[PDB]
Amino acid sequence: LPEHWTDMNHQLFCMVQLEPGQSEYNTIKDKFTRTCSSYAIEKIERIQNAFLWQSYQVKKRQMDIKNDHKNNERLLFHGTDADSVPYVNQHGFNRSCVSYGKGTYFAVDASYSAKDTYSKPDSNGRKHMYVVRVLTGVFTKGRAGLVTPPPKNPHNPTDLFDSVTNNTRSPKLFVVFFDNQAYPEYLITFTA
Amino acid sequence: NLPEHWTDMNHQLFCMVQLEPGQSEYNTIKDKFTRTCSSYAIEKIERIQNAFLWQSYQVKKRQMDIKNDHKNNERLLFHGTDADSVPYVNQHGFNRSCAGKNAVSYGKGTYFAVDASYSAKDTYSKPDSNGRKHMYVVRVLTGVFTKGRAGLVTPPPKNPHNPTDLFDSVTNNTRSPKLFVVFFDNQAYPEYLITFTA
Ligand SMILES: O=c1[nH]c2sccc2c2cc(O)ccc12
Numbered sequence: 001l002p003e004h005w006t007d008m009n010h011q012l013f014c015m016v017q018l019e020p021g022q023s024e025y026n027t028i029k030d031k032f033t034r035t036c037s038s039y040a041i042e043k044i045e046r047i048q049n050a051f052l053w054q055s056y057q058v059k060k061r062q063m064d065i066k067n068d069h070k071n072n073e074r075l076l077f078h079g080t081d082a083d084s085v086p087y088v089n090q091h092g093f094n095r096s097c098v099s100y101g102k103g104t105y106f107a108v109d110a111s112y113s114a115k116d117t118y119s120k121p122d123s124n125g126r127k128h129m130y131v132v133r134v135l136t137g138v139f140t141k142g143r144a145g146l147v148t149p150p151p152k153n154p155h156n157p158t159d160l161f162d163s164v165t166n167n168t169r170s171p172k173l174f175v176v177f178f179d180n181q182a183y184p185e186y187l188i189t190f191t192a
Numbered sequence: 193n194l195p196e197h198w199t200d201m202n203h204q205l206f207c208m209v210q211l212e213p214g215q216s217e218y219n220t221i222k223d224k225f226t227r228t229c230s231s232y233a234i235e236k237i238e239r240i241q242n243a244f245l246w247q248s249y250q251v252k253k254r255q256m257d258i259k260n261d262h263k264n265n266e267r268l269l270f271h272g273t274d275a276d277s278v279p280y281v282n283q284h285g286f287n288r289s290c291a292g293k294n295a296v297s298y299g300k301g302t303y304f305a306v307d308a309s310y311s312a313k314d315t316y317s318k319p320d321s322n323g324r325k326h327m328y329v330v331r332v333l334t335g336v337f338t339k340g341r342a343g344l345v346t347p348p349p350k351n352p353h354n355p356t357d358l359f360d361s362v363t364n365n366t367r368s369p370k371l372f373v374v375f376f377d378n379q380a381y382p383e384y385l386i387t388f389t390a
Pocket residue numbers: 077078079080105106107112113114118119173
């Protein structure tokens with residue numbers, strides 16, 4: 001369980017509200033305000049989910065071996081409705097719950113995830129967006145109807161890309177197709 | 193730390209090992225199969241050694257063993273497959289997104305049978321162009337389960353007022369389970385592949 005996490009009194013899940021103006025809060029706030037400076041942050045919470053973290057770190061170690069080094073991780077955004085926040089905190093992102101495939105979608109820019117279509121305002125005008133560690137690894141352009149990423153070579157049809165995107169040269173979204181390829185690290189509660 | 197009975201894979205992450213009749217390992221699987229599939233004949237039984245699937249499954253098992261109260265969370269179950277799906281399952285395991293709709297649906301997930309006879313149906317273990325049928329023997333994390341329902345995309349909550357605290361799997365009948373449905377990756381490890389014929 002990582003350093004920057006705070007003690008959980010032998011619990012396996014907790015949401016920890018960050019202290020405004022300390023380094024961790026400022027770092028996450030800056031990633032958001034890069035594209036969402038007109039939105040007001042009410043709070044940022046650190047998601048401390050020991051089981052999801054363990055499963056994600058195992059997939060990371062595997063992808064690091066498979067891809068032979070490489071930076072396989074990106075920090076991306078995911079807007080969700082308030083009704084899905086308890087499920088995601090506890091269980092992460094579930095493809096079963098889609099222009100570039102039937103997976104979970106993550107945005108490069110908070111502004112994309114800040115659309116009311118993704119971060120639906122609740123009865124109080126509050127919107128919710130995760131900052132997500134995503135194992136994007138080696139990626140290719142996606143297409144409608146994919147249930148997994150395409151093969152890297154159709155001569156070896158089981159050796160797959162790790163994720164797909166809208167644009168390989170200048171990506172703005174990534175889609176992953178497997179559980180435990182995405183770890184929800186922070187939850188931003190904000191208003192337009 | 194892979195199991196010590198596995199063949200040395202000499203840095204490789206994946207291997208199928210052909211078992212020898214007369215070995216306890218072959219005989220236990222043959223017996224489990226023939227209990228309900230005495231009319232079919234086994235061509236061969238291969239042990240599936242998939243390091244990454246094993247690691248991810250064992251992490252999930254350790255988590256369910258912690259979460260549940262001294263429960264036997266693991267059952268050894270059957271899964272019939274078409275020949276076209278065998279390479280993908282061997283490497284990547286069981287993907288709910290690829291699953292057929294079952295004739296009796298208890299949810300949208302991967303189905304595992306208690307009896308080899310269920311999986312031996314041509315609808316599940318489709319005979320290939322050479323008349324070979326394929327069935328996996330699978331370690332499945334059934335955990336704490338309840339009767340499923342066709343609408344499910346995740347197992348249902350144990351308690352309607354705590355929607356995120358889920359059953360581990362669902363079944364057709366809690367009193368006499370004959371099938372189990374799982375809704376998450378790395379909840380099922382394909383351990384053996386039985387190749388068999390009429
Ligand atoms: O942030 C997103 N949340 C959601 S919820 C379901 C779809 C999406 C989505 C799709 C994208 O292409 C890019 C971002 C997001």
